[PDB]
Structure 1
Amino acid sequence: NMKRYMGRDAQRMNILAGRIIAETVRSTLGPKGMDKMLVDDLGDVVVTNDGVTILREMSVEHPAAKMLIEVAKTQEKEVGDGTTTAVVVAGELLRKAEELLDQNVHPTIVVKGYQAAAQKAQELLKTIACEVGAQDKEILTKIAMTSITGKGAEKAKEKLAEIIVEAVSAVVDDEGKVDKDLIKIEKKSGASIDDTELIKGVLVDKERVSAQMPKKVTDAKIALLNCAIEETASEMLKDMVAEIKASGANVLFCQKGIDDLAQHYLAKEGIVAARRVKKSDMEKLAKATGANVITNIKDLSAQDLGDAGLVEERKISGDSMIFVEECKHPKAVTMLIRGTTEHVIEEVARAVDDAVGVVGCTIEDGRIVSGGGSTEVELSMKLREYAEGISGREQLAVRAFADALEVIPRTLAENAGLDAIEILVKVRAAHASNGNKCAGLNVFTGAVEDMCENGVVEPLRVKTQAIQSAAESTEMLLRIDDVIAAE
């Protein structure tokens, strides 16, 4: 009771389960990659190329397959981009492992070489990585450009990448990490894609509570009140209005409802107010302007008020919304991501998400590597010669580890249309002795080109995390010989 496989029947059951889900996302990789449509129990339709979003929301029930969905889940959590690459490598590491298992090379000699090779792969990637001075904006634009590319060449326009770099370099808390939560993302409509602007303000989908109040305010000290400013019919709000005036706040964002009596008194003072702003927008206003959300009107302080640079009720795209925005030295930045349809906007929103990560990782690390399966060949040849200096049966585990690294450049040709056998030799011979280190496959051109001059560059964290997450997972999976599954 109830389900058990013995030795050889258990090892092959776990390896096959990891490989079968790897082939599901193997076509998606590359600029010439494919998309997947997922229809669940509800009949809800969603089409995505992103490898991590496929594995999470589809029906998977095999115990061994569920353990491999933790690799991509920790890939999107740590890096973001390279979720597809982290899964495919893990599948090839299982394919090269079972070839050794059939020859009676023991799993612990395999795990001995696999760990030692991954330990050397991390210290070899550091030497081949290029340094991009944290504020080297011309390279940071290329890194951002490489991130937008892959999701679409038409999405990759010169002006878009220049906007993203300016936002990330500003939110750096010296010295000197990058917080991704400091950048606010707004999804609004209107004929755009090109009208996407780099913004200084939360965009609140609301108006002014009274038409008597000013349409625009200068240098607004913003009081974020969570508490209700409410009443009857006997001016019981003149205290509540004066308490806000005591702090010196000319703009008031209220999360709850503002009563009609208070609307007149706040308009008489000259204070602009808004009733029932979304809880999501209130948390944005607190971090962007530097404000504190206060849940009591009697204790509202002047040092709990935020500072904005432009507050205006513009009738943009027809809808009259409150522009907060605009800042001399902003530690928080808002991105007004706009497009024709909401489904386009959400895609342009997720495209920036990857572009923010890579530039943020470059500032924190220093470090980029050549993409398009370029550094995968350099690391592969450097670990095979590293295997030569290893005596024993653990050498063959390092050899299988290095031969598994050539799967990414091989799959990039599989989805491109070109032969995966011919190019795999062309790039391999173009890495020997000295040059290039930066030689890779360009899927549009066809011939092997220098990736440094093309503008195809990825952060070092995209490659270092993907290898370590796949190695640690495959090492654990090769340590299972008995499976106990109840029910």
Structure 2
Amino acid sequence: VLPENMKRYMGRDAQRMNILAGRIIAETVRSTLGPKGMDKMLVDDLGDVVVTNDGVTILREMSVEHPAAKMLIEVAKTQEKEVGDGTTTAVVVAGELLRKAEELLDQNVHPTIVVKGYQAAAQKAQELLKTIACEVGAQDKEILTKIAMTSITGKGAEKAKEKLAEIIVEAVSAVVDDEGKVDKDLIKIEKKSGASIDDTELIKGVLVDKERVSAQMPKKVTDAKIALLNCAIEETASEMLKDMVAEIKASGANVLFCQKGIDDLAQHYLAKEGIVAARRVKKSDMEKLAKATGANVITNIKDLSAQDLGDAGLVEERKISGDSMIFVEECKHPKAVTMLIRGTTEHVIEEVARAVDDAVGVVGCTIEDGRIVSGGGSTEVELSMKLREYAEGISGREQLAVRAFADALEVIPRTLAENAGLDAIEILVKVRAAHASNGNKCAGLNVFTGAVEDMCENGVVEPLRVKTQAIQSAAESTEMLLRIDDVIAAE
């Protein structure tokens, strides 16, 4: 009935393909998982070389064929949008869930029963996390740097996770404002080669990659009066063109950022009036500058008045790696800040720029929702234990899926230890026993010691949202996947 070119999978072949497809992704990314995990090199169709460990980035760059692997990516993308972290980690346990789920179908457990088991175990797993979830100060310096640093680790940049934590915690806490929701757009991620990662620095203002449009304009302005015009300073005839500049002067403005171009005659008039200016300014930069200086974005040059001017304590042209850039700093009430990332190579400042973007994310997560959980696999051990107990309370056929769900959550502690160079068997014997007795804040694996320790006391913590959202999205995707027995794909 169907047209030649349309393809179809069904029954165990559809389910086998679907489980294998998701498994392949999970097995691919789990190699970057953990402090002792490795990195990946993603090279595009032009030769552009990217260095990362992020599962999502890897999945966005790779071109997938199988729908099952595409759905696992959709989970990874939601995990990115919703939390930012837990990306790589969530994918791995999802593959395991599917790996084991197939056996349950092979054991003649109806897919709706496996779904019921995973649905039940995940609903209890959320309450379990909320039960052990540790409430902390939303703006607490210490825990904010503990979240920040643990997120930073496993990267070449971790050597400076202390400086990076201080930079991100400082920038974020300020731009949070109310209690609360933080906008990452208020923290600009700028990268310029030169110096090292410890030299990365936060400027409470806006750094733009612009220069002084005229040699005759000042290179430094104190108590700067910033004007923001999106209309090009270009007028037929010198009298009308001069009028434009005369209004900027008359308004008291002496720094001028034009979103569009500036006629060379206008650049002359600007330089004549002692007005320093830059043309072809990015709309985003026009916005950050308004938010920093408190300048009012003006459309028509004629409309610009003194009341529209923004304030900056210092506007100065400085060279970074030779490139001329403008620092707009010491503004009255800047709502925007700029983090300048330093490093010895383009790829170093590239990956660091990615690392600190995430650091902002996870710090913002902790401030927005003041609940965190103990890391080092301690939570996953809690869940395995209590879900094994719950499985007995569940009974019927569903217990088998609930039992397997709890076991599947162990693949993460297992992969961490494997990559750490530890025997997952000996680890789990000591960690699981030590966890059950000592508790949740007195457990997990310290891969740097090679033994069970106190992850919470060691500052090894992650935002609650990481663990809870990971379970929600991952569980629903694998339950859905199991429901499909027949896929029809047009070419």
State the TM-score bracket (shorter-chain normalisation): over 0.9
Residues 131, 367 of structure 1: 8 Å contact kept: yes
Q: 1:229 to 1:6 in 2, by over 3 A?
A: closer
Q: Give the 3 Å change call, closer, same or farther, for CA 274–131 of structure 1 in structure 2.
A: same
SS at match of 1:27: coil
Change (3 A) 1:67 1:135: closer
Report the more deviating stretch, 54-63 or 348-357: 54-63
Residue 107 of structure 1: how far off its partner (Å): 0.9
Q: CA deviation at 1:294?
A: 3.1
Give the % identical residues.
100
Mark the CA change 1:415 to 1:237 in structure 2 (over 3 Å): closer, same or farther: same
Is the counterpart of residue 118 in structure 1 residue 122 in structure 2?
yes
Q: Secondary structure at the match of 1:433?
A: helix
1:205-227 Cα shifts (integer Å, max 9, x gaps): 23223344333223323211111
Aligned residue for 2:456, secondary structure, equals helix
Task: Name the CA distance, whole Å, in 1 between partners of 2:69 and 2:418.
Answer: 24
Cα separation, 2, equivalents of 1:275 and 1:42: 32
**Residues of 2 paired with 1:452 and 1:437: CA distance?**
5
Deviation at 1:413?
1.0
Shift of 1:317: 4.5
How does the TM-score come out when normalised to structure 2? 0.93
Q: Is the 8 A contact 1:266 1:272 kept in 2?
A: yes
Unmatched runs of 5 consecutive residues or more in structure 1: none
State the secondary structure of the residue aligned to 1:169.
helix
- Structure 1 residue 282: deviation in Å? 3.0
Please tell me whether the aligned partners of residues 40 and 51 of structure 2 are also in contact (alpha carbons under 8 angstroms). yes
CA distance in 1, matches of 2:442, 2:476: 27
How high is the TM-score relative to the length of structure 1? 0.94
1:255 and 2:259 correspond = yes
Moved more, 400-409 or 31-40: 31-40
What's the CA shift for 1:292?
Answer: 4.2
Does 457-466 or 386-395 show the bigger shift? 386-395
- The answer (yes or no) to whether the contact 2:146–2:459 under 8 Å persists in 1 is yes
2:279 & 2:13 partners in 1: Cα distance? 65
**Relative to 1, partners in 2 of residues 1:485 and 1:258: Cα closer, same or farther, differing over 3 Å?**
closer
Q: Is the 8 A contact 2:217 2:275 kept in 1?
A: yes
Task: State the Cα distance separating 1:51 from its structure 2 match.
Answer: 0.9
Task: Note if contact 1:187-1:338 (Cα within 8 Å) is conserved in structure 2.
Answer: yes
Q: How far does residue 3 in structure 1 lie from its aligned partner after superposition?
A: 2.6
Q: 2:45 aligns with which of 37, 41, 44?
A: 41
Q: Provide the C-alpha distance between the structure 2 equivalents of 1:287 and 1:236, rounded to a whole number of angstroms.
A: 30
Q: Is the 8 A contact 2:378 2:440 kept in 1?
A: no
Aligned to 1:78: 82
Contact 1:195 1:338 survives alignment (8 Å): yes
- Whether the 8 Å CA contact 1:40–1:58 is kept in 2: the answer is no
In structure 2, relative to structure 1, the CA distance for the partners of 1:124 and 1:327 (3 Å cut) is farther
In structure 2, how many angstroms separate the alpha carbons of the residues matched to 1:437 and 1:406?
18
> Is the CA contact (8 Å cut-off) linking 2:293 and 2:332 kept in structure 1?
no
In the TM superposition, what whole-angstrom CA distance separates every residue of 1:134-165 from its partner, at most 9, and x where no partner exists? 12112211211112112137434433322221
1:419-473 per-position Cα deviation (integer Å, ceiling 9, x unaligned): 1222122111112245244411122211111111222111111111111110110
**Structure 1 residue 283, shift from structure 2 partner:** 3.8
Structure with the higher fraction of residues in helix conformation: 2
Asked if the contact 2:51–2:351 (Cα under 8 Å) also holds between the matched residues in 1, the reply is no
Q: 1:292 to 1:185 in 2, by over 3 A?
A: farther
**1:380 CA displacement:** 1.5
Task: Say if 1:145 and 1:156, in contact at 8 Å, map to a contact too.
Answer: no
CA distance in 2, matches of 1:160, 1:2: 52
Check the 8 A contact 1:132/1:140 in 2, yes or no: no
| Separation in structure 1 between the aligned mates of residue 418 and residue 263 of structure 2, nearest angstrom | 65
Q: Is the 8 A contact 1:200 1:309 kept in 2?
A: no
Q: Deviations over 1:296-353 (max 9, x none)?
A: 2122244543333321123455444321123465321111112222221111211111
Q: Which moved more, 1:108-117 or 1:203-212?
A: 203-212
Q: Secondary structure at the match of 1:421?
A: helix
Which structure 2 segments of 5+ residues have no match?
Answer: none
Shift in CA distance, 134/28, structure 1 to aligned 2, threshold 3 Å = same
Aligned length: 487
CA distance in structure 2 between the aligned counterparts of 1:210 and 1:56, rounded to whole angstroms: 43
Deviation by residue 1:210-255 (Cα, 9 ceiling, x = unmatched)? 3443332233232111111124564322321232234432211012
Is structure 2 residue 27 aligned with structure 1 residue 19?
no
